[PDB]
């Protein structure tokens, strides 16, 4: 086509989606990870995670307001990944890399899994 | 912080949100523009438009499944802007620039209004 493109549009959209999350505006699901609860937008979760994409395209699960993750999932690892989904920034540290990679594999977040594997290979 | 960032994350999120729109997945509102109807995600509309941000943060309007725009609004201008919201690409043409700018002013989409004013100033 003969379209023009606004370079910063996608970043500005995600920044605004994160502002809505911070003020709990139009969040439509709670993700339960052991004793912790995380409110989010189903569409953002689906856009970032192969697991949430499969869950919310399911004709029965699409209508659930609460999703319980596998008990092996670490709440801090999930929190770091939820922040990444809404900001593009990943708080990857020596103390959390194993939990973050295990959570990203479960959530089917391929680019996160890839950088975790590379950071782990560098330290061996 | 000591975060790393994935450059393409915001673009990939928006691409996936547009795929959901194309398959009518988790769309939660219909925007009526005269005889035309456009299905969309309230969160994406709010993230792109000052008008939709004000509408869906309203305690009564946040619960509406149908929003009727002002009858002066052109359906093609709205369609071009809805596409821009979900892709960052604006199909700006000599034949549609006036309708697109008028719609972007009504929707409170400042960057679109700015490029329209510049393209119009160049042709005078």
């Amino acid at each position: 086509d003969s379209c023009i493109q606004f370079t910063r549009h996608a970043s500005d959209v995600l920044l605004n989606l994160n502002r809505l999350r911070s003020r709990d505006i139009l969040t439509d699901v709670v993700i339960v990870v052991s004793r912790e609860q995380f409110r989010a937008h189903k569409t953002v979760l689906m856009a970032c995670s192969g697991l949430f994409y499969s869950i919310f395209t399911d004709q029965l699960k699409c209508n659930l307001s609460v999703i319980n993750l596998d008990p092996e999932i670490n709440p801090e690892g999930f929190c770091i990944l939820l922040d990444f989904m809404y900001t593009s920034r990943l708080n990857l540290r020596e103390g959390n890399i194993m939990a973050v990679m295990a959570t990203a594999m479960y959530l089917q977040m391929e680019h996160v899994v890839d950088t975790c594997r590379k950071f782990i290979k560098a330290s061996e | 912080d000591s975060c790393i960032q994935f450059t393409r994350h915001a673009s990939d999120v928006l691409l996936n949100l547009n795929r959901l729109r194309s398959r009518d997945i988790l769309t939660d509102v219909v925007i009526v523009v005269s005889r035309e109807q456009f299905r969309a995600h309230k969160t994406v509309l709010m993230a792109c438009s000052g008008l939709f941000y004000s509408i869906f943060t309203d305690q009564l309007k946040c619960n509406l499944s149908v929003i009727n725009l002002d009858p002066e609004i052109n359906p093609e201008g709205f369609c071009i802007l809805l596409d821009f919201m979900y892709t960052s690409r604006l199909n700006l043409r000599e034949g549609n620039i006036m309708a697109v700018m008028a719609t972007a002013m009504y929707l409170q989409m400042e960057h679109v209004v700015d490029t329209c004013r510049k393209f119009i100033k160049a042709s005078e």
Binding site: C3, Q5, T7 | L90
Partner: peptide, 4 residues
């Protein structure tokens, strides 16, 4: 704004 750019030419994509």
């Amino acid at each position: 704004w750019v030419i994509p």
